[PDB]
Design brief:
The structure is cut from a larger assembly and holds 3 copies of chain A, 1 copy of chain D (107 residues) and 1 copy of chain E (126 residues). Chain A is α+β, with helices and mostly antiparallel strands and 1034 residues long. Helices cover 19% and strands 25% of the residues of chain A. In chain A, the strands form 10 sheets. In chain A, strands 5, 9, 10, 11, 12, 14, 15, 41, 42, 52 and 53 form an 11-stranded mixed sheet that branches. In chain A, strands 25-24-23-22-31-19-34-51 form an 8-stranded antiparallel sheet, with no helix packed on it. Chain A is globular and about 130 Å long. In chain E, 4% of the residues lie in helices and 34% in strands. The chains are: A alpha+beta (1034), D mainly beta (107), E mainly beta (126). Chains A and E meet through helix 3, helix 4, helix 7 and helix 8 of A and helix 1 of E. Chain D: InterPro entries: FKBP-type_PPIase, PPIase_dom_sf, PPIase_FKBP_dom.
Chain lengths: 1034, 109, 98, 107, 126
């Protein structure tokens, strides 16, 4: 009720023993009443790491997209090793979304090992289940072997109608994924544990399909982008390997449907000046000159007749003596070129000022035998050359032509494919202009450049014309146990790419959301432009390039930081060597670096001196020391995880306030969220994502579904909370419902359409579907839809929500009116009360927890102790939790090695992982998520609670309670204990606790029993007894 | 100014060079000679007391902090095994002592 | 509840061996955070196993030599007695020598 | 009564008979998904006679029904023993079970 | 977009006089050249006759066949008077519209890219 405290555990297990006397009664009662329940004490397990690999083939659907909807691929298993290292090799294959599916290694939902189907942004099939939302779904198939080796499984996807299908060993499965959102781009994904070998079959060139695709679905190998080569890569990675060693990489520039759709400028609405007709035909005449030039350069020749294919020139005169068809043919496109110029901002009019007279018009090949042709080039480029502004104008003009052509091709219906299937309207060059290779770009802009030369020869007067994006930034900082408050240190940062790369020293309590340098807790230097950053931008040094190493020495004796670039001290504008001065001792400083989107660096802290380049150039004789040099193990580092997470409300927040009031009369106990600085300067207003901390879990199965009757209240199953919207708050900005632990959407232009709901349909294999089941990661409704007011609304809406632990029927109630919408979820959903709001008034939200007609309070739902009490209550554990954009997370000291390579046109690409890696995971029961156990090295409160939990475990089985010790062995396994013994990154208190727990639950009674007998020396008469002598014979 | 004077500026530009010769293990003898010049003695006298204090050479095994520094100093490509002559060692330590002692005098006068 | 005694014996002997080697190398990153947290839990394990009689002849020979090599070898190496220690590790060392 | 569902096929031909001590390694959970009894984690397989019912009765029935080399999830209804007043400290008195047990080297 | 109807011909015996009237309407653009294409059995799209504004027949492939293509720009409906029915004429026909007359392209590849193919109908020779 009050929360997780160590002092409560001390109070509990003061009953463990007294003066060295065990109390079996209290020991068994505490064991039986805490250890089977398991909602309070955190639990720890051993798992093995997983890795997800994708092909770089991103295909999606939107309004007018240039992509095809249907695609098909296969995976064939070479070999699996089941139950490797005491855990089954998890292996799922399916489809995943670039925008939303981030499979960060280590931790996550459930007990970690998050694969394809452990989220609503990806759907997979491991052989027997269609995994989605961390939930397995058994399905009947002809062969149920869970991807045994030498088995080939196909998977196809349709975007025009949302559909995902699998064909295990050629035989299709009886399940189909459908009704999923179509946002972003979908790619194949294979999630695997170690000790596995698979092959990615893409058909056609890269590999060959074992089974031909069903009609409609196309091979994925043809969807490869023109400038991209088919490469297997980790999906969302923050670390790679290079020449020097581990290379830290930042985020990546990802595509979507927005850049796959073209949006051109309409040029048919442009008025025609006289200059239109001024140049419309002189451009056409030079165009005819290029026509003669092209037929000369080709195998064609001179002729009077109207057939270029037979070595004939239709015009047969220098000036085109062209009929109505071809005259209009050149007329309209010359005009349209002028229309695009005017629309996009190029000026119009060609005042040559004797430049036409200067124009030679004498570059004639003279191959013509008669009056045909005789069109000479006028040396437009030689007389007047292009300028870079005009060349970029050429690029965007050809882009506009590409986009209008793509627009009409899409309107009639065309698809992108690397093979140009004309009868299928397939073409590899219909995607927007920002994606075609350099050949198409040059071939579509070179004639435009020649047209620009013609304009220059004509003397043309043409003149050339809240989301902080935490996803694009990543902060990497050494662990807070390595802080230095004295000494002189030095750590290198090597640059692989040139981007927004920041490097320096930061206070250990730096905020992950705000970027480096903006806060006073970061003395950082951005080497993209050389500028340093303590409380703002400051010009300094010089911008760097690829291959440059920055030295970043700090000395706390002189309270300064000095940066070196390639062994030479960077110099400030004023000429000062030190970038920052007058630094207080503070709490210490830590090596930190920020990487922009698509940046690669090498943060060499200085573990090995020979690897540490340029240290002798600057630092060996200067008295500075390599940061973390003598430490044998590599330094653990923490990266800013971009996955948003709910955290408890901070009372230190200067913008939001929560007031908790209990004992209210004619009112349930309430928590009011208000804006501390509404309508003031520098006030942040964004989407506020609330969530009450405690979960609500359904019963195991759905066996049976106003001064109320006490027995009916005791028999009820439903619960009801009410959120109250204040005057001045827009009901259209309020969303009330139910969040699963898997909710990680932080977008501030929130729409109910953006939520992820997906349905799974399992039926007869021959085509009679019977079972369908829908799920969603969220269950809000749109408050504007509910109010239907259609303008300040002073009325207070109590938009309350119902939930019954049986039959999953969730109905709503707005301003005392039953709701026409309902939701249905399977048992054991573990939902959370939630409300989303856009602050528009001083008073914003009031959570209200109480009872209603035939209604059991939500407090009685979330707390088992008061399940019979109808009185509403607000114990300190329940609280408002707000979403936070980013949070720190540990990077494991070792990552899974994967070897991926292609073998042949038939075999294709193969993925192999052999070395197994095991991680200990600490699972928080309420949030249904696990962190790495080593992550507690900076989470000191959870460290305190887990150390005291180990103390509880030791002393419930202390003093020879072998029954309870056996009961403990389920919680704490033998292999678990062995790994906690062997590892070195375990914190101090946890290490001592686990060692003493092993001794207590396995060796304490036996050791005591032997110790009580070592006092005596009862010795019998044996031939071994006559063997002992005082001095052994040397 | 005094700090920006070009003589001290060249000197501080050449301290990396001017500490490149001496071994890190020699820093004990550096400190003893440091006090020796602090006593305002002549060059001959400080060198004589340097020879009198020669045997108090630092030990590589004493601290791992200087162990890897010795690894750098021995693995330095320009270093040679014949440069272990105590005469060259004492001349270079007394010279470095004179330079940086007057240097710290100018920084903290 | 049971657990492999011979596996625990070899595993703990190896763990304290690498702990002694690390204490020889004088790292600035002691396992767990401090020399105390590096040594006291392992020494509790060794003391409990020793009084429980699990260790064999060759194994206690290793333990003796690796507490103190020069004095305790039969007919450089930094002993656990040889290198300096905090209070709690000394306490467990005395419980081992007893 | 149990709901036995095969996971990976095995021999499918040799089934345990009444009067044979079979050796099985398993990972037992509750209906929630709750790893508490894992002989794989303990690295020690478990032996059981069929007929004496030294093992829990639902596991005994499902183990008789599976074959060597094959793994199956046994969904054990609470009518299996210690379904009321269960083993203290590990299992609350009234709850379900599941066991992803495979049989290896049937004796 | 320009979404023209391809029709004309059908099942016929050898040497069958067929008027393949491909109808085009609802199109302001790509009214210059109105080409005819043909998939022979196991063959690519072979152009047969590309009429042009002013009723100008194009001769690039299969000039020998008496295609006799005609069109008026008033209604943009083309009609192909194909009598010669060779065995390889047992095939399918297509009707494309574009504003680049065949045998005349001094701009580049995008101008050729502007084209609007047809439905596709069988003309069978027996």
């Amino acid at each position: 009720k009050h929360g997780r405290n160590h002092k409560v555990l001390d109070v509990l297990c003061s009953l463990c023993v007294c003066n060295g006397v065990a109390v079996r009664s209290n020991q068994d009662l505490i064991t039986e009443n805490l250890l089977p329940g398991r909602e309070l004490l955190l639990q720890t397990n051993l798992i093995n790491y997983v890795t997800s690999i994708r092909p770089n083939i991103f295909v999606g659907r939107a309004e007018g997209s240039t992509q095809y909807g249907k695609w098909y691929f296969e995976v064939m298993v070479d070999e699996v090793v089941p139950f490797l290292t005491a855990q089954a090799t998890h292996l799922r294959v399916g489809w995943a979304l670039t925008e939303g599916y981030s499979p960060y290694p280590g931790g996550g939902e459930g007990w970690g090992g998050n694969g394809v189907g452990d989220d609503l942004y990806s759907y997979g099939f491991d052989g027997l289940h269609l995994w989605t939302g961390h939930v397995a779904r058994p399905v009947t198939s002809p062969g149920q072997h869970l991807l045994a080796p030498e088995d080939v499984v196909s998977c196809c996807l349709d975007l025009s109608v949302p559909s995902i299908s699998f064909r295990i060993n050629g035989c299709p499965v009886q399940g189909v994924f459908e009704a999923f959102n179509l946002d972003g781009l979908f790619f194949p994904v294979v999630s695997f544990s170690a000790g596995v070998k698979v092959r990615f079959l893409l058909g056609g060139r890269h590999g060959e399909f074992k089974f031909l695709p069903p009609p409609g679905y196309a091979p994925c190998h043809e969807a490869v982008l023109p400038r991209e080569r088919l490469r297997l890569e980790p999906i969302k990675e923050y670390r790679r390997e290079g020449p020097r060693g581990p290379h830290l990489v930042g985020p990546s520039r990802c595509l979507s449907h927005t850049d796959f759709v073209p949006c051109p400028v309409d040029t048919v609405q442009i008025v025609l000046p006289p200059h239109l007709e001024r140049i419309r035909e002189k451009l056409a005449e030079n165009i005819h000159e290029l026509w003669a030039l092209t037929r000369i350069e080709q195998g064609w020749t001179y002729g009077p007749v109207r057939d270029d294919n037979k070595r004939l020139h239709p015009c047969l005169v220098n000036f085109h003596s062209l009929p109505e068809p071809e005259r209009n043919y050149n007329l309209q496109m010359s005009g349209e070129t002028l229309k695009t110029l005017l629309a996009l901002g190029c000026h119009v009019g060609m005042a040559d000022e004797k430049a036409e007279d200067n124009l030679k018009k004498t570059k004639l090949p003279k191959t013509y035998m008669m009056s045909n042709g005789y069109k000479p080039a006028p040396l437009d480029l030689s007389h007047v050359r292009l300028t870079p502004a005009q060349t970029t104008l050429v690029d965007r003009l050809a882009e506009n032509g590409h986009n209008v052509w793509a627009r009409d091709r899409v309107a009639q219906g065309w698809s992108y494919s690397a093979v140009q299937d004309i009868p299928a309207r397939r073409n590899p060059r219909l995607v927007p202009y920002r994606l075609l290779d350099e050949a198409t770009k040059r071939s579509n802009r070179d004639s435009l450049c020649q047209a620009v030369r013609t304009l220059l020869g004509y003397g043309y007067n043409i003149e050339p014309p809240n989301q902080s994006r935490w996803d694009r930034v990543r902060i990497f900082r050494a662990e807070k146990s390595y802080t230095v408050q004295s000494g002189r240190w030095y750590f290198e940062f090597e640059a692989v790419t040139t981007g927004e790369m920041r490097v320096g020293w930061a206070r250990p309590e730096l905020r992950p959301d705000v970027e480096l340098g903006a806060d006073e807790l970061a003395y950082v230097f951005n080497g993209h432009r050389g500028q340093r950053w303590h409380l703002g931008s400051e010009p300094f040094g010089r911008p760097w390039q690829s291959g440059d190493v920055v030295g970043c020495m700090i000395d706390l004796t002189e309270n300064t930081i000095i940066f070196t670039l390639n062994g030479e001290v960077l110099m400030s504008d004023s000429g000062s060597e030190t970038a920052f001065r007058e630094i207080e001792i503070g709490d210490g400083f830590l090596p930190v670096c920020s990487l922009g989107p698509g940046q690669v660096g090498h943060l060499n802290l200085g573990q090995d001196v020979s690897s540490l380049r340029f240290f002798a150039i600057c630092g060996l004789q200067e008295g500075f020391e390599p940061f973390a040099i003598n430490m044998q193990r590599p330094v653990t580092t923490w990266f800013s995880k971009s996955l948003p997470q709910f955290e408890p409300v901070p009372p230190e927040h200067p913008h939001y306030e929560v007031a908790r009031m209990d004992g209210t009369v004619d009112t349930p106990p309430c928590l009011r969220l208000a804006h501390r600085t509404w309508g003031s300067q520098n006030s942040l207003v964004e989407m506020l994502f609330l969530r009450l901390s405690l979960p609500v879990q359904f019963h195991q199965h759905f066996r049976c579904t106003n001064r109320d009757d006490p027995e009916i209240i005791l028999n009820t199953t439903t619960y009801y909370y009410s959120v109250r919207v204040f005057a001045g708050q827009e009901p259209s900005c309020v969303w009330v419902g139910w969040v699963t632990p898997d909710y990680h959407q932080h977008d501030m232009n929130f729409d109910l359409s953006k939520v992820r709901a997906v349905t799974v349909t399992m039926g007869d294999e021959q085509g009679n579907v019977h079972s369908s089941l829908k799920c969603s990661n969220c269950y809000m409704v749109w408050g504007g839809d509910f109010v239907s007011p259609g303008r300040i609304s002073h009325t207070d809406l109590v938009i309350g929500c119902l939930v019954d632990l049986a039959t999953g029927l969730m109905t709503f109630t707005a301003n005392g009116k039953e709701s026409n919408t309902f939701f249905q979820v399977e048992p054991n959903t573990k939902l959370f009360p939630a409300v989303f709001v856009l602050p528009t008034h001083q008073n914003v939200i009031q959570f209200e927890l109480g009872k209603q007609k035939n209604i059991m309070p939500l407090s009685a739902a979330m707390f088992l102790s008061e399940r019979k009490n109808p009185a509403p209550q607000c114990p300190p554990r329940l609280e408002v939790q707000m979403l936070m954009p980013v949070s720190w997370s540990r990077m494991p000291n070792h990552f899974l090695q994967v070897e991926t390579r292609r073998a042949g046109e038939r075999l294709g690409w193969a993925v192999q992982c052999q070395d197994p890696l095991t991680m200990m995971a600490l699972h928080i029961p309420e949030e249904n998520r696990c962190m790495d156990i080593l992550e507690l090295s900076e989470r000191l409160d959870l460290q305190r609670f887990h150390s005291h939990t180990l103390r509880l475990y030791r002393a419930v089985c202390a003093l020879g309670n072998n029954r309870v010790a056996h009961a403990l062995c389920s919680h704490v396994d033998q292999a678990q204990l062995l790994h906690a013994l062997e590892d070195a990154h375990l914190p101090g208190p946890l290490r001592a606790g686990y060692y003493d727990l092993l001794i207590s639950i396995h060796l304490e009674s036996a050791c005591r029993s032997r110790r009580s007998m070592l006092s005596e020396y009862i010795v019998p008469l044996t031939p071994e007894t006559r063997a002992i002598t005082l001095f052994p014979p040397g | 100014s005094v700090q920006t004077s070009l003589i001290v500026a060249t000197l501080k530009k050449m301290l990396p060079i001017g500490l490149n010769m001496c071994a890190p293990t020699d820093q004990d003898l550096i400190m003893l000679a440091k006090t020796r010049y602090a006593l305002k003695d002549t060059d001959e006298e400080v060198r004589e007391f340097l020879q009198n204090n020669l045997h108090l050479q630092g030990k590589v095994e004493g601290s791992p902090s200087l162990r890897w520094q010795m690894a750098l100093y021995r693995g330095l490509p320009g270093r040679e095994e014949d440069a272990d002559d105590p005469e060259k060692i004492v001349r270079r330590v007394q010279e470095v002592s004179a330079v940086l002692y007057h240097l710290e005098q100018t920084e903290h006068p | 509840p049971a657990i492999p005694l011979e596996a625990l014996r070899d595993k703990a002997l190896r763990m304290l061996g690498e702990a002694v080697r690390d204490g020889g190398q004088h790292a600035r990153d002691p396992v767990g955070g401090s020399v105390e947290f590096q040594f006291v839990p392992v020494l509790k394990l060794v003391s409990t196993l020793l009084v429980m009689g699990i260790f064999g002849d060759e194994d206690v020979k290793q333990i003796l030599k690796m507490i103190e090599p020069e004095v305790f070898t039969e007919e450089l190496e930094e002993g656990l007695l040889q290198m300096k220690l905090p209070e709690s590790v000394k306490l467990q060392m005395c419980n081992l020598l007893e | 009564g149990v709901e036995i569902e095969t996971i990976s096929p095995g021999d499918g031909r040799t089934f345990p008979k009444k009067g044979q001590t079979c050796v099985v390694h398993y990972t037992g959970m509750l209906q929630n998904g709750k790893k508490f009894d894992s002989s794989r984690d303990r690295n020690k397989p478990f032996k059981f006679r069929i007929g004496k019912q030294e093992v829990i009765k639902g596991f005994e029935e499902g183990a008789a029904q599976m074959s060597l080399g094959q793994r199956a999830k046994l969904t054990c209804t609470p009518d299996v023993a210690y379904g009321a007043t269960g083993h203290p400290g590990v299992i609350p008195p009234n709850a379900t079970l599941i066991f992803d047990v495979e049989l290896l080297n049937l004796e | 977009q320009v979404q023209l109807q391809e029709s004309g011909g059908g099942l016929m015996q050898a040497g069958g006089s067929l008027r393949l009237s491909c109808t085009a309407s609802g199109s302001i653009f790509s009214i210059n050249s109105m080409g005819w294409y043909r998939q022979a059995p196991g063959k690519q799209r072979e152009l047969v006759a590309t009429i042009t504004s002013g009723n100008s027949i194009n001769y690039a492939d299969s000039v020998k066949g008496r295609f006799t293509i005609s069109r008026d720009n008033a209604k943009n409906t083309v009609y192909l008077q194909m009598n010669s029915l060779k065995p390889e004429d047992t095939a399918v026909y297509y009707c494309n519209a574009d504003r680049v007359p065949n045998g005349y392209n001094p701009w580049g590849t995008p101008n050729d890219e502007y084209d609007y193919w047809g439905q596709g109908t069988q003309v069978t020779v027996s």
